[PDB]
């Protein structure tokens, strides 16, 4: 759970930039491999062999590809290997799924595959996909993210950027992409992921990143640190040359404002991203609860409290994930929306997260499983969960709501801080009391929280001070 001082500073910075909304991703081929990297020599082996060349002797693979286009006067043979087959091997990394889950608004990529767009759709995120310059003219309304496919798309291989001659003229043929990228480079913090210094195309991509020093920003790029001891037909002299050479790569990236984030293995990347996610989600609050009745609370008193709580979370900079429970979810919605439109300059519709809950069975899944998948997904978008009331009618009598407990379990199992408010009674009280029954188990990560949950579980707790105590708890948890 602890990283380098350099990685640690990157985590702190990118979390903050995710919160402000200026975080961006630039994705290379490595991101579309569970491996995390690509062997370019092997990909071009056959193209070179068809020219009487060999990737062992040819170190300029961009020129080899161009020679292939020249000799056959056509892009198709090249396109089959480096675009068509290359993209069918694409697989979503763990790092890929994390980045698609986070509320990152801007994805740039030179990949041809559809993994980014596909993952966004799976996570119920409406994507504005820019596959060609024409797509840049109009903005998809209410999009959750924009995805720039700089070099085209497997969907239209004829329009993809594949070989040297196209790279050389990209600044004119695709001026719109370059202009958009230059704007994002001076307004956003990029995470470059999936790039290697054996990428034949790297220099072309990096040369597009120049901006006036007055406006230059600092960005980040994952790189695997070269291992110490030999590889293949190498000796300790060859190993040390391989390593010290990498120091010049790292310094070169600074030209473009890019700071290398070194990892010893590609498997380290998803762990760093998970840490970023967990720290970032501490400001996204899941509201769990439902009510057929309100017990020691008057209904309008309860709904008014829920409304005010939701509004305050928005006004204090939190994102609210609505559990959509009966008799609670409507007040969550109305409270958050009231705050949003109170100050449409400051707050945003992004601060209220709503996704439809299951209504009907499917042929493949019972309502049983759709509900559990819904709760897992919604809690997955949050870092803290508040539990309120929680009761429903069953065979004519009021019972504590099992679905509220299930959300509680999912949250605990996944590291989401659980904050039941026992003063609201019912399942919230049942859960608060249960936590206090084993403080060494339930309050390991935050021992100071036992006292707070105990005060808020007291049925005679002062209801006017609940909101401010919750707010102080959430700020300390962050």
Active site residues: 151
User: Alpha helix locations (H) across 382-465?
Assistant: 402-413, 426-437, 439-442, 449-457
Contacts for 319 with CB less than 8 Å, ≥ 6 apart: 283, 284, 285, 350, 351, 352, 353
Residues 318-337 that bind a second copy (CB under 8 A): 324, 326, 329-330, 333-335, 337
Residues 315-344 that bind Na ion (CB under 5 A): 330
Q: Work out how close the CB of 326 gets to a second copy at its nearest, in angstroms, rounded to a whole number.
A: 7
* Residue closer to a second copy, measured from CB, 359 or 460: 359
Residue 305: contacted member of Na ion, a second copy, none (CB under 5 to 8 Å, by partner type): Na ion
Q: Which of 6, 88, 165, 186 binds a second copy (CB under 8 A)?
A: 186
Counting residues that bind a second copy (by CB under 8 A) gives 37
List the Cα angle 153/159/164 in 5-degree steps.
Answer: 100
List the Cα angle 49/50/55 in 5-degree steps.
Answer: 30
CA-to-CA distance for 164 and 412, rounded, in angstroms? Answer: 52
Q: Which of 1, 5, 57, 137 binds a second copy (CB under 8 A)?
A: 137
Residue 333: contacted member of a second copy, Na ion, none (CB under 5 to 8 Å, by partner type): a second copy
Q: Work out how close the CB of 175 gets to a second copy at its nearest, in angstroms, rounded to a whole number.
A: 11
Quick one: residue 200, left, alpha or beta (phi over 0 = left, psi -120 to 50 = alpha)? alpha
Residue 21: contacted member of Na ion, a second copy, none (CB under 5 to 8 Å, by partner type): a second copy
Q: Work out how close the CB of 344 gets to a second copy at its nearest, in angstroms, rounded to a whole number.
A: 5
Q: Work out how close the CB of 286 gets to Na ion at its nearest, in angstroms, rounded to a whole number.
A: 15
Q: Work out how close the CB of 275 gets to a second copy at its nearest, in angstroms, rounded to a whole number.
A: 25
Residue 363 touches a second copy, criterion: CB under 8 A: no
Residue 295 touches a second copy, criterion: CB under 8 A: no
Applying CB under 8 A, the span of 76-84, 179-187, 197-205, 255-263 interacting with a second copy comes to 179-187
Applying CB under 8 A, the span of 133-141, 201-209, 363-371, 436-444 interacting with a second copy comes to 133-141
* Residue closer to a second copy, measured from CB, 41 or 304: 304
Residue 306 touches Na ion, criterion: CB under 5 A: no
CA-to-CA distance for 12 and 14, rounded, in angstroms? Answer: 6
Residue 302 touches Na ion, criterion: CB under 5 A: no
Any idea which residue has 């936590």 for tokens? 435
CB neighbourhood size of 324 (10 A): 19
CB neighbourhood size of 8 (10 A): 13
Contacts for 218 with CB less than 8 Å, ≥ 6 apart: 189, 257, 258, 259
Closest CA to 324 of 284, 362, 350, 288: 288
CA-to-CA distance for 87 and 149, rounded, in angstroms? Answer: 14
Site string for a second copy, 417-456 (x = CB under 8 A): ----------------------------------------
CA atoms within 13 A on the CB side of 200: 21
Angle between helix 402-413 and helix 426-437 axes, rounded to 10 deg: 40
* Residue closer to a second copy, measured from CB, 113 or 128: 128
Residue 304 touches a second copy, criterion: CB under 8 A: yes
Residue 396 touches a second copy, criterion: CB under 8 A: no
Are 404 and 414 spatial neighbours (Cβ–Cβ below 8 Å)? no
Tell me which DSSP letter residue 317 carries: T
Residue 270 touches a second copy, criterion: CB under 8 A: no
- Chain residues in the site for Na ion (CB under 5 A): 305, 330, 401-403, 463
Q: Which residues bind a second copy (CB under 8 A)?
A: 21, 105, 121, 124, 126-127, 137-139, 141-143, 183-184, 186-187, 304, 307, 324, 326, 329-330, 333-335, 337-338, 341, 344, 348-350, 354-357, 359
């Amino acid at each position: 759970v602890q990283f380098s001082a350099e990685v640690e500073a990157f985590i702190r910075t990118y979390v903050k930039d995710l919160e402000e909304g200026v975080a961006a991703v630039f994705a290379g081929a490595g991101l579309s491999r569970t491996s995390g990297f690509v062997n370019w020599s092997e990909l071009l082996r056959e193209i070179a062999e068809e020219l009487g060349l060999s990737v062992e002797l040819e170190h300029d693979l961009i020129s080899v590809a161009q020679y292939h286009v020249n000799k056959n006067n056509s892009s198709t043979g090249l396109a089959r290997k480096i675009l068509e087959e290359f993209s069918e091997q694409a697989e979503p990394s763990e790092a890929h799924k994390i980045l698609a889950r986070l509320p990152i608004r801007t994805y740039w990529t030179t990949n041809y595959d559809t993994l980014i767009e596909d993952s966004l759709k799976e996570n119920y995120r409406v994507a504005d996909i820019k596959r060609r310059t024409d797509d840049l003219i109009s903005t998809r309304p209410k999009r959750d993210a924009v995805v720039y496919k700089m070099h085209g798309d497997v969907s239209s291989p004829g329009d993809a950027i594949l070989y040297k001659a196209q790279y050389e003229q990209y600044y004119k043929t695709h001026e719109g992409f370059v202009t958009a990228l230059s704007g994002d480079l001076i307004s956003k913090t990029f995470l470059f992921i999936g790039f290697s210094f054996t990428d034949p195309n790297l220099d072309y991509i990096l040369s597009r990143l120049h901006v006036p020093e007055k406006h230059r920003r600092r960005h980040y790029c994952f790189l695997r640190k070269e291992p110490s001891l030999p590889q293949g037909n190498e000796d300790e002299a060859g190993a040390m040359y391989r390593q010290r050479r990498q120091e010049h790569h790292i310094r070169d990236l600074l030209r473009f404002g890019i700071q290398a984030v070194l990892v010893n293995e590609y498997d380290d990347i998803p762990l760093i991203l998970k840490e970023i996610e967990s720290r970032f989600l501490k400001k996204t609050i899941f509201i769990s609860g439902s009510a057929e009745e309100y017990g020691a609370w008057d209904k309008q008193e309860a709904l008014n409290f829920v409304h005010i709580l939701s509004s305050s979370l928005v006004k204090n900079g939190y994102r609210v994930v609505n559990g959509f429970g009966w008799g609670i979810g409507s007040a969550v919605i109305n409270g958050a929306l009231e705050a949003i439109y109170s100050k449409p300059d400051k707050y945003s519709e992004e601060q209220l997260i709503m996704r439809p809950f299951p209504q009907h069975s499917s042929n493949d899944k019972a309502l049983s499983e759709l509900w559990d998948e819904y709760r897992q997904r919604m809690i997955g978008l949050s870092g803290i969960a508040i539990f309120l009331f929680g009761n429903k009618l069953h065979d004519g009598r009021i019972v504590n709501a099992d679905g509220v407990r299930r959300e509680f379990q999912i949250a605990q199992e996944t590291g989401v801080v659980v904050l039941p408010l026992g003063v609201t009674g019912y399942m919230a009280k049942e859960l608060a009391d249960e936590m206090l029954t084993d403080p060494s188990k339930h309050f390991v990560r935050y021992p100071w929280l036992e006292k707070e949950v105990a005060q808020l579980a007291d049925l005679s707790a002062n209801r006017a001070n609940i909101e401010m105590k919750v707010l102080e708890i959430l700020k300390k948890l962050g």
